[PDB]
Design a protein around this ligand. Sequence first.
Ligand SMILES: Cn1c(=O)c2[nH]cnc2n(C)c1=O
Ligand SMILES: Cn1c(=O)c2[nH]cnc2n(C)c1=O
Lengths: 233, 233
Amino acid sequence: AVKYLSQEEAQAVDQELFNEYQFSVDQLMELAGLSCATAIAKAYPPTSMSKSPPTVLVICGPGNNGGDGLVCARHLKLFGYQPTIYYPKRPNKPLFTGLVTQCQKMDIPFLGEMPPEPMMVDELYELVVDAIFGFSFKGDVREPFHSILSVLSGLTVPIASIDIPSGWDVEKGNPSGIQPDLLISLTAPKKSATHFTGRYHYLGGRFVPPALEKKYQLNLPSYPDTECVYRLQ
Amino acid sequence: AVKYLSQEEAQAVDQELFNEYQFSVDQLMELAGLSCATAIAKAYPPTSMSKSPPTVLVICGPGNNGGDGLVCARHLKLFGYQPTIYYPKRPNKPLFTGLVTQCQKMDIPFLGEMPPEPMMVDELYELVVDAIFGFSFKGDVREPFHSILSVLSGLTVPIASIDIPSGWDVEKGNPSGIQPDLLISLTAPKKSATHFTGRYHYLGGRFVPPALEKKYQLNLPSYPDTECVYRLQ
Ligand SMILES: Cn1c(=O)c2[nH]cnc2n(C)c1=O
Ligand SMILES: Cn1c(=O)c2[nH]cnc2n(C)c1=O
């Protein structure tokens, strides 16, 4: 069966990838974000949703998970969804300034603020994508993210979390945290994923060189044909 | 029906993408190379090939098409193929030095030279990927590419060309050029694709913002579900 990583194991795999294999940051981020988008479309495809086009709020954090979120949003657009992004804290680097402009001229909107009540979120959006915190998260959940997460736990619409349900401890989880319905584990799942009890768990990030998989004994399952995601069960 | 571009139209679409939309070079190159790999796997999937794992020679040029080739090779590896790269002329930039190392630690080999007879190519490789020249090609086909193309036209195994059959005039074609069996048109097809008479023509590069498609009246067909390629016929 497939292996679930420690924060330490995953920080290590990630640094091989950029330092040894010399994969570039935005290369992998593109592929990670595509997988997210691809998991969401397979779990909640347009035909099955009530709105044509189905609506989605993508909430992006201040670090790389936020980045994956921006990329996901843009592929969601192309896959037939009507996404909206809340990106309250934006790092000033070209990486992120470029992902912002791309989404803008796709006509994907950026909310100036978070709807403060879960019911309004539920009414506006058929799905919320949690791209706030990922693998390297150590916090200390500070504002404005505490109250975002507090709105999220009152939602009736599904939450799709990228890599790690934000607010959960990367290894241990959080019983009183948000309880997503879809989780996209990128590269390899993290021990906190054994606490996941939603209906959909996909593996994404089809870019792990087989010698890395053999080295860290990841026992990655075989993605089918040309797919960039695989449903874990 | 879908539109076929002039060199001038495509140089323009490409420069919007990087200058206006601020898509990054390696972002799109990743997605282009993934589509190539995905077209090849759907046209010539492992189960249908005689070797397990099916073998492939990817021939990379000195410019961006070569880049797409390197990316294709690496996804081909993950998709279940045993690729080999001939990259005789290598630009010294991180972009390309990184794509080279990635392939190396995937255990994808780089030929020191081209097999000089088509029969040897046919015996070693079940498929040849032509990533030599693409859209911005103006040449003046110089060495060592003249003799590569001259080996290629004597092949019995299929050739898969990325974007433009190398040696063909980007608009007009070339009746006495190489005659690929698969063509992957990236972003949008080029007028030379109306001269293509092989069995497989896929469109790839699922990243065109709809307002660009509407502006340059590309009439892009609808890629199905989450696929990054579409078969044209
Ligand atoms: C292990 N690992 C991850 O868990 C992850 N999540 C997002 N990018 C990631 N990368 C690049 C990674 O190597
Ligand atoms: C139009 N066009 C192309 O035809 C192409 N081929 C490879 N990259 C490409 N890009 C980025 C592009 O914009």
